[PDB]
Amino acid sequence: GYQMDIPKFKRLPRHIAIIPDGNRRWALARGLEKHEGYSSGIIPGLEVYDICVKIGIGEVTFFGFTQDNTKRPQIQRKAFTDACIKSVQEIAKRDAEILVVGNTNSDIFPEELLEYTKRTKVGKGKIKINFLINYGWYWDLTYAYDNSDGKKMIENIASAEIPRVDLLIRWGGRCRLSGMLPVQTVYSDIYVVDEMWPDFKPEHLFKALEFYQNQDITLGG
Amino acid sequence: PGYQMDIPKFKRLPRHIAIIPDGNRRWALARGLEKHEGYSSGIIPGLEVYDICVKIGIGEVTFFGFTQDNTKRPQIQRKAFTDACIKSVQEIAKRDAEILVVGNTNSDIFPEELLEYTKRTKVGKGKIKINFLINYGWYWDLTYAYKMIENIASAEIPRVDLLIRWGGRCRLSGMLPVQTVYSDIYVVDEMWPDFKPEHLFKALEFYQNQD
Numbered sequence: 001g002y003q004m005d006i007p008k009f010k011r012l013p014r015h016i017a018i019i020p021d022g023n024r025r026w027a028l029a030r031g032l033e034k035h036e037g038y039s040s041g042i043i044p045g046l047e048v049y050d051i052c053v054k055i056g057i058g059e060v061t062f063f064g065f066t067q068d069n070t071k072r073p074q075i076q077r078k079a080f081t082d083a084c085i086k087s088v089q090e091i092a093k094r095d096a097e098i099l100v101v102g103n104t105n106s107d108i109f110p111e112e113l114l115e116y117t118k119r120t121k122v123g124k125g126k127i128k129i130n131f132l133i134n135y136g137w138y139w140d141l142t143y144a145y146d147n148s149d150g151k152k153m154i155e156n157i158a159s160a161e162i163p164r165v166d167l168l169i170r171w172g173g174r175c176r177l178s179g180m181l182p183v184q185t186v187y188s189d190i191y192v193v194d195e196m197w198p199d200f201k202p203e204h205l206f207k208a209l210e211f212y213q214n215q216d217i218t219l220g221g
Numbered sequence: 222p223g224y225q226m227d228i229p230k231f232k233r234l235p236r237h238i239a240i241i242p243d244g245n246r247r248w249a250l251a252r253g254l255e256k257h258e259g260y261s262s263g264i265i266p267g268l269e270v271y272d273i274c275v276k277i278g279i280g281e282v283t284f285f286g287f288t289q290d291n292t293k294r295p296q297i298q299r300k301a302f303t304d305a306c307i308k309s310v311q312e313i314a315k316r317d318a319e320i321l322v323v324g325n326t327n328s329d330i331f332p333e334e335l336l337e338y339t340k341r342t343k344v345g346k347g348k349i350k351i352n353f354l355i356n357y358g359w360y361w362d363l364t365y366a367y368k369m370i371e372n373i374a375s376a377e378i379p380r381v382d383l384l385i386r387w388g389g390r391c392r393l394s395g396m397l398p399v400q401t402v403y404s405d406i407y408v409v410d411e412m413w414p415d416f417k418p419e420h421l422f423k424a425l426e427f428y429q430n431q432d
């Protein structure tokens with residue numbers, strides 16, 4: 001990417017979840033149409049990827065779009081779907097183990113991303129990058145209720161390949177999960193960046209990691 | 222002008238508030254008390270939240286009491302938080318509420334005293350729903366189903382609009398994963414025993430400012 005001066009951390013999360021929210025508000029603030037902000041959301045994700053590789057984060061899960069999101073106008077659906085496709089394809093030009101998780105039994109799931117629905121090594125690998133594409137919390141839990149029993153259910157949710165989230169970072173100033181991986185996020189420390197996702201700065205992630213290293217982790221204990 | 226600051230008028234209210242009354246052990250340690258001594262100082266704060274919610278007309282409040290995960294803690298701490306949870310429900314039972322306790326009753330950790338409240342119980346004039354999670358667990362809740370999603374253990378408890386957590390941590394600690402998927406979360410840095418009405422007022426200001 002480009003040269004940064006990255007702070008030293010005493011403790012790092014194994015698995016970060018990213019909610020790249022605020023693209024529509026960012027676009028409206030600059031006098032663009034709501035849907036135009038998604039096309040300015042790709043380079044921020046590449047900056048997150050570059051920082052995580054440099055500091056040695058093992059796994060990053062990006063919130064792409066949910067089944068709930070596909071209720072929005074067509075022009076928005078096309079914009080966020082196009083940006084999700086480009087994002088996965090950009091990580092595919094780099095060093096990663098890519099996994100896409102979402103409901104592939106839908107016309108809404110992009111054909112371009114089917115190849116990534118089993119973990120796929122690109123370049124040298126050595127960081128796990130997950131994308132939630134046509135994901136839904138309800139679809140995720142009900143996958144287990146249908147296809148499992150009892151103790152087995154939890155192990156058989158749709159997102160079962162994605163492990164517990166240590167740190168969840170959300171851009172766009174809202175403090176809410178928007179149904180991201182309810183099972184993996186029961187204990188996650190949540191950090192909210194007030195700036196919209198397209199206004200990403202390395203300091204956003206540095207401040208989130210400073211927050212994480214200051215937390216007492218009990219995982220329900 | 223009066224003893225207490227007046228309860229503000231809010232332009233938007235949540236239908237359902239979740240409360241995580243965290244920080245009791247850190248509060249106790251900071252005062253030079255033993256870890257388990259914080260819990261008994263967390264009961265009056267709950268009654269203050271109850272009183273304020275009745276005054277503004279909040280429809281439903283769910284209090285995080287203790288989880289199955291929490292019963293991994295030392296016996297002296299388990300007895301302290303269990304005793305304080307029992308007292309809390311009994312104090313609401315002397316007032317005006319529709320009380321529901323949700324939790325795994327199939328345990329010698331679940332207090333016999335609260336079995337009568339595992340079906341929704343109208344006390345006094347009712348007019349507010351008060352829920353307590355007692356020996357609750359997210360894993361127990363989701364697996365209880367064994368349509369299935371609508372038959373989770375906590376099915377009677379609706380979507381949480383606003384979740385307020387004391388003790389400065391921004392995390393759910395497995396509180397109602399299904400009901401909290403879209404919840405707005407407000408964190409109070411002060412430990413729960415240091416509850417002030419302004420904590421709840423600022424949380425409600427936060428909620429009414431959301432889009």
Ligand SMILES: CC(C)=CCC/C(C)=C/CC/C(C)=C/COC(CO)CO
Nearest residue numbers: 020021041045046062064080083084087
């Ligand atoms: C690693 C890389 C390269 C990109 C990762 C970030 C990403 C998926 C950017 C695509 C833009 C996008 C649809 C963000 C999703 O925002 C959601 C919440 O607000 C839905 O509207």
Ligand SMILES: CC(C)=CCC/C(C)=C/CC/C(C)=C/COC(CO)CO
Nearest residue numbers: 242243260263267268284286305306309
């Ligand atoms: C409505 C009323 C009156 C009281 C409700 C609050 C209550 C049950 C107090 C009881 C003691 C207490 C605070 C327990 C909470 O501790 C948990 C959080 O950290 C442990 O996991």
